Amino acid sequence: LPRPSISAEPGTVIPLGSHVTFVCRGPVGVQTFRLERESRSTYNDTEDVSQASPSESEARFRIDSVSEGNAGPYRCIYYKPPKWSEQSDYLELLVK
């Protein structure tokens, strides 16, 4: 149960009305990835997990039509049956 990592495509700075894709990574054997807002506390779960390497699985989350409301810190957590991981480091989305 390593610490998950979070990244953003195309990056942390997003124009208004555009989109961003959050990519969480964990070890193999993840059943669920959660994208969690640290602020506004909304979660996003998926089991749409792909294997990116022998020791790495990932899940992607797209947020569309970003506005000032979606700006803030995001974190990833995974469930590797039967235990939930620690949270990832945060990533702040800036909506310019």
Side-chain angles (χ1 to χ4, degrees), residues 1-39 41-82 84-96:
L1 291 172
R3 195 182 182 131
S5 63
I6 186 173
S7 35
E9 291 178 4
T12 52
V13 192
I14 303 298
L16 215 150
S18 167
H19 64 285
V20 60
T21 294
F22 286 104
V23 189
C24 311
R25 282 159 184 82
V28 299
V30 165
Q31 193 196 300
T32 296
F33 273 103
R34 178 165 301 166
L35 191 66
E36 158 188 3
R37 300 194 73 187
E38 172 163 271
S39 35
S41 303
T42 53
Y43 307 150
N44 211 109
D45 302 341
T46 194
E47 312 179 343
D48 183 26
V49 192
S50 65
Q51 184 158 316
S53 77
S55 83
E56 199 166 328
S57 68
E58 54 167 69
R60 301 178 149 259
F61 292 102
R62 194 220 290 131
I63 298 166
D64 278 306
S65 179
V66 307
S67 65
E68 283 65 19
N70 321 89
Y74 294 73
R75 274 169 131 118
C76 300
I77 206 173
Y78 63 86
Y79 178 82
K80 188 172 178 160
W84 280 100
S85 58
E86 197 106 348
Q87 280 167 310
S88 74
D89 287 307
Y90 62 98
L91 202 50
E92 296 178 342
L93 187 50
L94 298 60
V95 168
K96 82 159 181 169

